[PDB]
Amino acid sequence: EHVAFGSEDIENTLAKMDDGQLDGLAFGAIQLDGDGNILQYNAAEGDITGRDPKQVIGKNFFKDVAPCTDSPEFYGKFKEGVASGNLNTMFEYTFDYQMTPTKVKVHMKKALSGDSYWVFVKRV
Ligand SMILES: *C(=O)/C=C/c1ccc(O)cc1
Protein backbone atom coordinates (compact mmCIF):
# COMPACT_ATOMS: atom_id res chain seq x y z
CA GLU A 1 0.00 0.00 0.00
CA HIS A 2 1.75 3.20 -1.34
CA VAL A 3 1.73 5.78 1.51
CA ALA A 4 4.71 7.20 3.53
CA PHE A 5 5.07 7.62 7.29
CA GLY A 6 4.58 11.29 8.17
CA SER A 7 2.71 12.17 4.97
CA GLU A 8 0.79 15.42 5.15
CA ASP A 9 -2.50 13.80 4.13
CA ILE A 10 -2.01 10.37 5.76
CA GLU A 11 -5.41 10.51 7.50
CA ASN A 12 -7.22 10.87 4.15
CA THR A 13 -5.53 7.86 2.56
CA LEU A 14 -6.09 5.56 5.53
CA ALA A 15 -9.75 6.59 5.80
CA LYS A 16 -10.26 4.76 2.49
CA MET A 17 -8.53 1.51 3.64
CA ASP A 18 -9.82 -1.90 4.80
CA ASP A 19 -7.92 -4.28 7.16
CA GLY A 20 -5.84 -5.96 4.46
CA GLN A 21 -4.94 -2.58 3.02
CA LEU A 22 -3.85 -1.32 6.47
CA ASP A 23 -1.74 -4.48 6.76
CA GLY A 24 0.14 -3.46 3.59
CA LEU A 25 1.59 -0.27 5.06
CA ALA A 26 5.35 0.01 5.49
CA PHE A 27 4.87 1.32 9.06
CA GLY A 28 2.92 0.27 12.16
CA ALA A 29 -0.58 1.73 12.43
CA ILE A 30 -2.84 1.66 15.48
CA GLN A 31 -6.23 3.39 15.69
CA LEU A 32 -7.45 4.30 19.21
CA ASP A 33 -10.60 5.91 20.55
CA GLY A 34 -10.29 8.87 22.88
CA ASP A 35 -10.12 6.53 25.90
CA GLY A 36 -7.23 4.57 24.37
CA ASN A 37 -9.17 1.44 23.37
CA ILE A 38 -7.71 -0.28 20.32
CA LEU A 39 -9.95 -0.05 17.22
CA GLN A 40 -7.42 -1.12 14.53
CA TYR A 41 -3.92 -2.64 14.72
CA ASN A 42 -2.00 -3.58 11.58
CA ALA A 43 0.37 -6.41 10.70
CA ALA A 44 3.44 -4.16 10.48
CA GLU A 45 2.90 -3.07 14.10
CA GLY A 46 2.67 -6.70 15.27
CA ASP A 47 5.94 -7.37 13.42
CA ILE A 48 7.64 -4.76 15.64
CA THR A 49 6.03 -5.68 19.00
CA GLY A 50 5.18 -9.38 18.90
CA ARG A 51 1.47 -8.69 19.51
CA ASP A 52 -1.12 -10.64 17.52
CA PRO A 53 -3.30 -7.91 15.89
CA LYS A 54 -6.50 -9.86 16.40
CA GLN A 55 -5.78 -10.39 20.12
CA VAL A 56 -5.15 -6.73 21.01
CA ILE A 57 -8.28 -5.28 19.34
CA GLY A 58 -10.55 -4.02 22.07
CA LYS A 59 -7.91 -3.82 24.78
CA ASN A 60 -6.75 -0.55 26.28
CA PHE A 61 -3.45 0.58 24.84
CA PHE A 62 -2.25 2.68 27.79
CA LYS A 63 -3.47 0.45 30.67
CA ASP A 64 -3.11 -3.11 29.27
CA VAL A 65 -0.96 -3.42 26.15
CA ALA A 66 1.66 -0.61 26.36
CA PRO A 67 2.26 0.55 29.97
CA CYS A 68 5.64 2.01 29.01
CA THR A 69 3.63 4.63 26.99
CA ASP A 70 1.62 5.66 30.08
CA SER A 71 3.73 8.80 30.59
CA PRO A 72 3.50 12.57 29.95
CA GLU A 73 5.63 12.14 26.82
CA PHE A 74 3.26 9.76 25.08
CA TYR A 75 -0.15 9.32 26.75
CA GLY A 76 -0.04 12.90 28.06
CA LYS A 77 0.38 14.27 24.53
CA PHE A 78 -2.32 11.93 23.21
CA LYS A 79 -4.79 13.15 25.82
CA GLU A 80 -3.96 16.82 25.14
CA GLY A 81 -4.60 16.36 21.44
CA VAL A 82 -7.84 14.48 21.93
CA ALA A 83 -9.07 17.30 24.17
CA SER A 84 -7.97 20.16 21.94
CA GLY A 85 -9.35 18.45 18.82
CA ASN A 86 -6.41 18.75 16.41
CA LEU A 87 -3.90 15.98 17.28
CA ASN A 88 -0.78 15.97 15.03
CA THR A 89 2.57 15.45 16.69
CA MET A 90 5.82 13.42 16.49
CA PHE A 91 8.34 12.11 19.05
CA GLU A 92 10.92 9.32 19.58
CA TYR A 93 10.41 6.52 22.12
CA THR A 94 11.57 3.14 23.37
CA PHE A 95 9.13 0.20 23.41
CA ASP A 96 10.18 -2.45 25.97
CA TYR A 97 7.26 -4.27 27.60
CA GLN A 98 7.00 -7.98 26.60
CA MET A 99 9.31 -7.28 23.63
CA THR A 100 13.01 -6.64 23.17
CA PRO A 101 13.78 -2.92 23.76
CA THR A 102 13.15 -1.21 20.41
CA LYS A 103 13.74 2.45 19.47
CA VAL A 104 10.91 3.96 17.40
CA LYS A 105 9.56 7.19 15.94
CA VAL A 106 5.87 7.85 16.72
CA HIS A 107 3.43 10.09 14.82
CA MET A 108 0.02 10.76 16.41
CA LYS A 109 -2.74 12.19 14.20
CA LYS A 110 -6.53 12.62 14.46
CA ALA A 111 -8.51 10.30 12.13
CA LEU A 112 -11.47 11.37 9.99
CA SER A 113 -14.01 9.11 11.63
CA GLY A 114 -15.44 10.21 14.95
CA ASP A 115 -13.70 9.56 18.26
CA SER A 116 -10.73 8.02 16.40
CA TYR A 117 -6.97 8.77 16.61
CA TRP A 118 -3.99 7.22 14.79
CA VAL A 119 -0.70 6.19 16.39
CA PHE A 120 1.90 5.42 13.67
CA VAL A 121 5.20 3.72 14.46
CA LYS A 122 8.46 2.98 12.63
CA ARG A 123 11.83 1.72 13.76
CA VAL A 124 14.77 4.07 14.17
C1 LIG B 1 5.65 -0.10 26.18
O1 LIG B 1 5.09 -0.73 27.11
C2 LIG B 1 5.21 -0.24 24.79
C3 LIG B 1 4.52 -1.31 24.38
C4 LIG B 1 3.91 -1.48 23.07
C5 LIG B 1 3.96 -0.46 22.11
C6 LIG B 1 3.31 -0.56 20.90
C7 LIG B 1 2.58 -1.71 20.64
O2 LIG B 1 1.95 -1.82 19.45
C8 LIG B 1 2.50 -2.75 21.60
C9 LIG B 1 3.16 -2.61 22.81
From Swiss-Prot:
UniProt keyword list? Chromophore, Photoreceptor protein, Receptor, Sensory transduction
What superkingdom heads the lineage? Bacteria
Q: Which one of the record's GO molecular function terms can you name?
A: photoreceptor activity
One GO biological process term is: regulation of DNA-templated transcription
Against InterPro entries, the record matches this protein to: PAS (IPR000014), PAS-like_dom_sf (IPR035965), PAS_fold (IPR013767), PYP (IPR012130)
Query: Where's the PAS domain?
Result: 22-85
Residues with the modification S-(4-hydroxycinnamyl)cysteine, per the entry, are C68
Q: PTM comment for this protein? A: The 4-hydroxycinnamic acid (p-coumaric acid) chromophore is covalently bound via a thioester linkage.
In the record, the note on similarity to other proteins reads: Belongs to the photoactive yellow protein family.
Subunit architecture: Monomer.
The job of this chain, per UniProt, is described as:
Photoactive blue light protein. Probably functions as a photoreceptor for a negative phototaxis response.
- The name under which this protein is listed is Photoactive yellow protein
Q: Which organism is it from?
A: Halorhodospira halophila (Ectothiorhodospira halophila)
